[PDB]
Amino acid sequence: AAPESFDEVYKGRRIQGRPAHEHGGGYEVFVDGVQLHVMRNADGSWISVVSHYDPVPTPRAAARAAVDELQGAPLLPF
């Protein structure tokens, strides 16, 4: 079952998620229009490449963790 899509502005940045050199992962996340690699773990938690070792419950939580990590910086594409 894929998670639902989402779209919001979080700490001033547009984050989006949608069901769909890296894995073919069934969900995409974008931060200000740039795609962020994210991955789902067996227990249903999610991570992203900029917060890979800290599982969070949902792809939106991963997108928000990425905006926190970035501290305003643009993401570079993978």
Add this chain to the structure above:
Amino acid sequence: TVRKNQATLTADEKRRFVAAVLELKRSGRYDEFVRTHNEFIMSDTDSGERTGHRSPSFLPWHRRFLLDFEQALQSVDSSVTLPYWDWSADRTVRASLWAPDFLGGTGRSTDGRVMDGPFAASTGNWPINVRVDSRTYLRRSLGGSVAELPTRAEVESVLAISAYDLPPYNSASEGFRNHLEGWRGVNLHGRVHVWVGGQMATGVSPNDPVFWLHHAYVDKLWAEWQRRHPDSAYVPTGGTPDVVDLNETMKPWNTVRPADLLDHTAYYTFDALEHHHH
């Protein structure tokens, strides 16, 4: 080759290690290690092919990856070996690890920028090139995202686990490998990445030289586990889809198997490693 506790390096050993690391960066060789790592981080998945992470081969894969990096260092200075960081013992920001004559300390609070040591962006010697967060300076927030490093008591409870790994051989497994990797339990190796913060908390974590010292201690804990459990060995042992079996070769090298990497003494020893005993 003897791998030494970082806390015990002489001033001359620290100087030579740092100079060798900076030369690999200057010559362009360093960044290819960062890129390989991030490619496995992004490609290793719990429901598909998995080789460097979230799988039984997490330990032999990082052992060979660190061997490749140590051999690169030795091609620059043949006396240098990788030191290890025992984060269960040297657990505060005042560890000599984090001094300006070694790896430099924590990042300033506004942007996480490391401001001292040889790898500080202001030196001009440590550009962050292979990256996802577009900033190009080394960042850290020691203890920022997680309150404490693992303790010796926590490490001991993971070393006491008899089974190397267990089906389903991924981040949901019980068993030693996944408790050390950290996806189940009190979390050892992943928690340390979180605790350092900055690039170490990302798939491009080898951008921070502490990466190598962390993994050298994870590698030492595998050696300790084998001493504790001489009767227990790598699993699985053949015919497992998407997982590297004992005698299967491992990407990217393709010329090495977990079986060839179980015994570290063929490549290096440690300054101290308890032998088997009750």
